[PDB]
Amino acid sequence: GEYVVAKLDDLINWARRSSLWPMTFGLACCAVEMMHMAAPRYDMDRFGVVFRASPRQSDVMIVAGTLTNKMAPALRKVYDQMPEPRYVVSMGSCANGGGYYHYSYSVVRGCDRIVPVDIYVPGCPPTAEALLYGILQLQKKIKREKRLRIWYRR
Amino acid sequence: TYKYVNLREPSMDMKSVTDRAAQTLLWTELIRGLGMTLSYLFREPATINYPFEKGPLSPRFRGEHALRRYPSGEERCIACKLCEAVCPAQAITIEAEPRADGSRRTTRYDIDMTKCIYCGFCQEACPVDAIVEGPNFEFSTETHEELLYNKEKLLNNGDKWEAEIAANIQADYLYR
Amino acid sequence: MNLMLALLTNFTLATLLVIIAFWLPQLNVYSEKTSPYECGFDPMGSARLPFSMKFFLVAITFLLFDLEIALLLPLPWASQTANLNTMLTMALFLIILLAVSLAYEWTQKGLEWTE
Amino acid sequence: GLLKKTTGLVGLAVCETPHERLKILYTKILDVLGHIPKNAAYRKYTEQITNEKLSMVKAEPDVKKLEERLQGGQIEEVILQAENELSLARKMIQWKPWEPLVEEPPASQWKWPI
Amino acid sequence: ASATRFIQWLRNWASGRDLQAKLQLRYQEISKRTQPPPKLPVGPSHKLSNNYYCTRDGRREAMPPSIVMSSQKKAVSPAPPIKRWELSQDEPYL
Amino acid sequence: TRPTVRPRNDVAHKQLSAFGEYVAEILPKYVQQVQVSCFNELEICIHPDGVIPVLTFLRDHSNAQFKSLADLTAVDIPTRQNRFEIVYNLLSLRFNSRIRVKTYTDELTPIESSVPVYKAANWYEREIWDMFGVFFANHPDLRRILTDYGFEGHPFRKDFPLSGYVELRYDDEVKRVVAEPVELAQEFRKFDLNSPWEAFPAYRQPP
Amino acid sequence: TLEGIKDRVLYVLKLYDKIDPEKLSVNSHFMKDLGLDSLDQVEIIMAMEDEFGFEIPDIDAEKLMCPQEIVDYIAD
Amino acid sequence: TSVKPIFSRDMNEAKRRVRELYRAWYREVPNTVHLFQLDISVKQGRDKVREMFKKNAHITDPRVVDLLVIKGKMELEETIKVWKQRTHVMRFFHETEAPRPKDFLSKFYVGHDP
Ligand SMILES: CCCCCCCCCCCCCCCCCC(=O)OC[C@H](COP(=O)([O-])OCC[N+](C)(C)C)OC(=O)CCCCCCCCCCCCCCCCC
Ligand SMILES: CCCCCCCCCCCCCCCCCC(=O)OC[C@H](COP(=O)(O)OCCN)OC(=O)CCCCCCCCCCCCCCCCC
Ligand SMILES: CCCCCCCCCCCCO[C@@H]1O[C@H](CO)[C@@H](O[C@H]2O[C@H](CO)[C@@H](O)[C@H](O)[C@H]2O)[C@H](O)[C@H]1O
Ligand SMILES: CCCCCCCCCCCCO[C@@H]1O[C@H](CO)[C@@H](O[C@H]2O[C@H](CO)[C@@H](O)[C@H](O)[C@H]2O)[C@H](O)[C@H]1O
Ligand code: SF4
Ligand code: SF4
Ligand code: SF4
DSSP G6-29: HHHHHHHHHH-TTS-TTT--TT--
Could you tell me if F48 and F30 are in contact, meaning their C-beta atoms sit under 8 angstroms apart? Answer: no
Cβ(F170)–Cβ(C32) below 8 Å: no
Chain A residue closest in CA terms to C25: A84
Burial G14-35 (b: 16+ CB within 10 A, else e): eeeeebeeeeeeeebebeeebe
**Is C44 close to H86, i.e. CB distance below 8 A?**
no
A120 lies within 8 A of chain B by CB: yes
Experimental method: cryo-EM
Query: Closest by alpha carbon to F30, among F150, F112, F147?
Result: F112
- What CATH fold (topology level) applies to the domain C7-107? Methane Monooxygenase Hydroxylase; Chain G, domain 1 (1.20.58)
Ligand 3 neighbour C96 (Cβ under 6 A): yes
Contacts of D among chains (3+ CB pairs under 8 A): E, F
Task: Decide if A56 touches C, using CB distance below 8 A.
Answer: yes
CB contact under 8 A, F186 and B112: yes
Candidates D101, D97, D57; CA nearest to D79 is D57
Angstrom distance (rounded) from CA B74 to CA B52: 36
For residues F124 and F73, is the Cβ–Cβ distance under 8 A?
yes
Nearest residue by C-alpha to atom 42 in ligand 2: B30
Identify the residues whose C-beta falls under 6 Å from ligand 4: C 96, 99, 102-103, 106-107, 109
User: Any idea how long chain C is?
Assistant: 115
Q: What is the DSSP string of B55-95?
A: ----TT---SEEE-B-TTS-B------HHHHH-TT--EEEE
Identity of the amino acid at F64: A
Distance CA D88, CA D96 (A): 12
Partners of residue H54 in chain G, C-beta under 8 Å: 39
Of all protein residues, the one whose alpha carbon is nearest to atom 20 of ligand 2 is: B25
Residue D46 has a CB neighbour count (10 Å cut-off) of 25
Query: Are H96 and F144 in contact (CB < 8 Å)?
Result: no
Among A2, B37, D96, smallest CA distance to F57 is for D96
Q: How far apart are the C-alpha atoms of H114 and H103, rounded to whole Å?
A: 10
Strands in F31-36's sheet, in edge-to-edge order, are: E66-70, F31-36, F42-46, F97-105, F84-92, F68-76
**Atom number, ligand 7, closest to the C-alpha of residue B131:** 1
Instruction: Give the DSSP H or E segment for B172.
Output: helix B151-172
The single-letter code of the amino acid at E40 is L
What is the dihedral sign for C-alpha A118, A123, A124, A127? negative
- Nearest bound ligand to the CA of residue C82: 3
Chain H residue closest to G57 (CA)? H20
Å from CA of B148 to ligand 6 middle? 13
Query: How far is Cα E59 from Cα F166, in angstroms, rounded to an integer?
Result: 42
Chain F residues close to B112, C-beta within 8 Å: 186
Pocket-testing residue among B24, B31, B36, ligand 2, by greatest number of atoms within 8 A of Cβ? B24
Distance E34 CA to ligand 6 centre (A): 28
Count CB pairs under 8 A between chains D and F: 91
Q: Alpha carbon of B94 to those of B73, B106, C2: distances in Å?
A: 21, 7, 83
CB F134 within 8 A of CB F108: no
Beta carbons of G39 and H27 less than 8 Å apart: no
| Per-residue DSSP letter, A120 | E
Q: A residues 64-83 near H, CB within 8 Å?
A: 73
Q: How far apart are CA D91 and CA D77, in angstroms?
A: 21
- Say if the Cβ atoms of A122 and B139 lie within 8 Å: yes
What is the number of other CB atoms lying within 10 angstroms of the CB of residue C56? 11
B116 lines ligand 6 (CB under 6 A): yes
How many Cα atoms are found within 13 Å in the side-chain-facing hemisphere of B4?
Answer: 10
Question: Which atom belonging to ligand 3 lies closest to the Cα atom of C100?
Answer: 1
Rounded CA separation F20/F58 (Å): 12
DSSP letter (8 states) at residue F7:
P
Q: Show which of residues 36-65 on chain B sit within 8 Å of chain E, judged by CB atoms.
A: 36, 38-40, 42-44, 46, 56
SS3 track for F11-71: HHHHHHHHHHHHHHHHCCCCEEEEEECCCCCEEEEECHHHHHHHHHHHHHCCCCCCCEEEE
Pair F102, F87: CB distance under 8 Å: yes
Closest partner residue to H84 among F137, F142, F150, by Cβ?
Answer: F150
Query: Which chains reach chain A with 3 or more Cβ–Cβ distances below 8 angstroms?
Result: B, C, F, H
**B91 marked ligand binding residue:** no
Distance (Å, whole) CA F124 – CA B40:
47
- Cα(A56) to centroid(ligand 1), Å: 19
DSSP bridge partners of B111:
B92, B149
Pocket test of ligand 7: the residue of B67, B75, B76, B83 to mutate, having most ligand atoms within 8 Å of its CB, is: B83
- Closest ligand to Cα B115: 6
* CB distance B140 to A139 below 8 Å: no
- Residues of F contacting chain H (CB within 8 angstroms): 108-110, 135, 137, 142-144, 148-150, 171, 173-174, 176-180
The DSSP output letter for A52 is B
CA distance G58 to chain H (A): 7
Residue type (1 letter), H5:
P
Contacts of G52 by beta carbon, 8 Å cutoff, 6+ apart: G5, G8, G74
Comparing CA positions, the residue from A133, A9, A143, A120 lying closest to residue A63 is: A120
Shortest Cα distance, chain H CAs vs residue F142, angstroms: 8
- How many Å apart are CA C68 and CA C56, to the nearest integer? 19
Question: For the packed helices G67-75 and G2-15, what is the interaxial angle rounded to 10 degrees?
Answer: 140
- G72 belongs to the catalytic site: no
Report whether F100 contacts F54 (CB < 8 A): no
- Where in chain C are the domains? 7-107
Active-site hit among G37, G40, G50, G60:
G37
- Give the C-alpha separation, A134 to F121, whole Å: 45
Beta-carbon count within 10 A of F191 CB: 9
Chain C residues with CB under 8 Å of H81 CB are: 44
Pairwise CB contact (< 8 Å): F186 & B93:
yes
Task: Please tell me the total number of residues recorded for chain F in this structure.
Answer: 207
For residue F156, report the phi and psi dihedrals to the nearest 5 degrees: -80, 5
- Resolution value, angstrom units: 2.4
Integer Cα distance of F111 and D98 in angstroms: 22
- CB contact at 8 A, B109 and B150: yes
Q: How far is CA E52 from the centre of its chain?
A: 33
Distance CA(F107)–CA(F132), nearest Å, equals: 9
Closest to F23 (Cα-Cα) out of F109, F92, F75, F82:
F92
Is A94 annotated as a binding-site member?
Answer: yes
**Distance between CA atoms of F159 and F144, rounded to whole angstroms?**
19
